[PDB]
Amino acid sequence: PVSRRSFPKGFIFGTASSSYQYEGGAAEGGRGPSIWDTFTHQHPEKIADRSNGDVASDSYHLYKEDVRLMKDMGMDAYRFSISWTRILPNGSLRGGVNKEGIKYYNNLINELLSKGVQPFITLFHWDSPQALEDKYNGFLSPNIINDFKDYAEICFKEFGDRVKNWITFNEPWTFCSNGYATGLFAPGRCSPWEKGNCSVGDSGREPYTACHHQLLAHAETVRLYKAKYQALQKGKIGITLVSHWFVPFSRSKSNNDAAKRAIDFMFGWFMDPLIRGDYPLSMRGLVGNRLPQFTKEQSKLVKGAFDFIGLNYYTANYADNLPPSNGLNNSYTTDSRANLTGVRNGIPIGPQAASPWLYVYPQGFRDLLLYVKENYGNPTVYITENGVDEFNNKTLPLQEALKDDARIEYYHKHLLSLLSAIRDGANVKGYFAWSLLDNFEWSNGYTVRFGINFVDYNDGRKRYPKNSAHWFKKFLLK
Numbered sequence: 001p002v003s004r005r006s007f008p009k010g011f012i013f014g015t016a017s018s019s020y021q022y023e024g025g026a027a028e029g030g031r032g033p034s035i036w037d038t039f040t041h042q043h044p045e046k047i048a049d050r051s052n053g054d055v056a057s058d059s060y061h062l063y064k065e066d067v068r069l070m071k072d073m074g075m076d077a078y079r080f081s082i083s084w085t086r087i088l089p090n091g092s093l094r095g096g097v098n099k100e101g102i103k104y105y106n107n108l109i110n111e112l113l114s115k116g117v118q119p120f121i122t123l124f125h126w127d128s129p130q131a132l133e134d135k136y137n138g139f140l141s142p143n144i145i146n147d148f149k150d151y152a153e154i155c156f157k158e159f160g161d162r163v164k165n166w167i168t169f170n171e172p173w174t175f176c177s178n179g180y181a182t183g184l185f186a187p188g189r190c191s192p193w194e195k196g197n198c199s200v201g202d203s204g205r206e207p208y209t210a211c212h213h214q215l216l217a218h219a220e221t222v223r224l225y226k227a228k229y230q231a232l233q234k235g236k237i238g239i240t241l242v243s244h245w246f247v248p249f250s251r252s253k254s255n256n257d258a259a260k261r262a263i264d265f266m267f268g269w270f271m272d273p274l275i276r277g278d279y280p281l282s283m284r285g286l287v288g289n290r291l292p293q294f295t296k297e298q299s300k301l302v303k304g305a306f307d308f309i310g311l312n313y314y315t316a317n318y319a320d321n322l323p324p325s326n327g328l329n330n331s332y333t334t335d336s337r338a339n340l341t342g343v344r345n346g347i348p349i350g351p352q353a354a355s356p357w358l359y360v361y362p363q364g365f366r367d368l369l370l371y372v373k374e375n376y377g378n379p380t381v382y383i384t385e386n387g388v389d390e391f392n393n394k395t396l397p398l399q400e401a402l403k404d405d406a407r408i409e410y411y412h413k414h415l416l417s418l419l420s421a422i423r424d425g426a427n428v429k430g431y432f433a434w435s436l437l438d439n440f441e442w443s444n445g446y447t448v449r450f451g452i453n454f455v456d457y458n459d460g461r462k463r464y465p466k467n468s469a470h471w472f473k474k475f476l477l478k
């Protein structure tokens, strides 16, 4: 049976977390508010259970238990994020550096290393400073670049002596599409007719502006890291990107081209600038002047601006051709001219998890990795997120809640799929499971549980290993 020993020597296995989802202590230790603090408190109706990340999984206090839990399993590495507003409470240098915030992450990093766990740090996992949102609309302004760069530099200076793996942005696709196209995530911006029924926004322009600025802030940060830090600290810097696998709705060329446009808009949006120096052709053609243009100098900067790419995979969609709109309802969601579904002829592409967007389709994992291999020059890849969820069920006894056989099944099949892709030449160096603990699942709150370990929110955030924790322990032997 598949184990760590099936994988190449030195292959890294870990779990993944994020600051807002895990930490809590939201107004503690000098932490400033982020856009997710604001979104959750000011728009509780946008969250399934009207909840927030004030306490979350309380990892701000309980991080030592987290490290113990992952060490028990035999994890090599931990993917976590730093809260921007823990370090810079109002987003900028001039607003002051929070020493207490630096202390917490030093304590976390030191605890991890004392137990032989390598820290992988995401700089931006969506908890953008509210003060910069108020000041200049955050990522909608080119002002965000320098503020992010200043924030990143503090992190390199304070932590880079021990941290050798950096990720700038987590899934800019999700941040921009849900935050500015549908308006379902913070900062909750969209066109009036879009899903979020937002008071402010433009779903056909703002997603592209926000993500253009992220690509620029990323490339600037990579450059800065390589120029001032990489020589003496000898770490690696990358970016985390998400993609579904897209199955053509039918075998027609039209639906095959729709599947190609689907991946271009979700994934190529960031990959093409990183590999080829410009946005995908389909994006430039279809979006036109609503898509920002890189200057020759900016194109030079973004191209090759990485040591690795973090790759996230969860599910697959069917892609069906959409006729032009062709009109006054322009939105990133429809701009691809590809209609995305998880069901065809009343049959779901795979078994549906607790998240309605999550269909279990392990075959697409291999398919995506081989697509990246053949179409992007087979770059160094870490799987930075892969996982599945069950419903939070208050009626179930604890012992039945810990029996997550569906999670075991999910990981077994995906790791096999990953292994076959590696054996067929995919340049994959590591794998991170989402998630170590149950946590705040954004617009779903605490209604769904992604964790390998259970968190009892009603009993002081006590952690209990699920059956999958024991499974990973066996898997990770040696």
Ligand SMILES: *[C@H]1O[C@H](CO)[C@@H](O)[C@H](O)[C@H]1F
Pocket: 018, 021, 170, 171, 312, 385, 434, 440, 441, 442, 450
């Ligand atoms: C990756 O996906 C998971 C599951 O939806 C989120 O909880 C993480 O924050 C995201 F980075």
Ligand SMILES: [Zn+2]
Pocket: 058, 061, 062
């Ligand atoms: Zn506590």
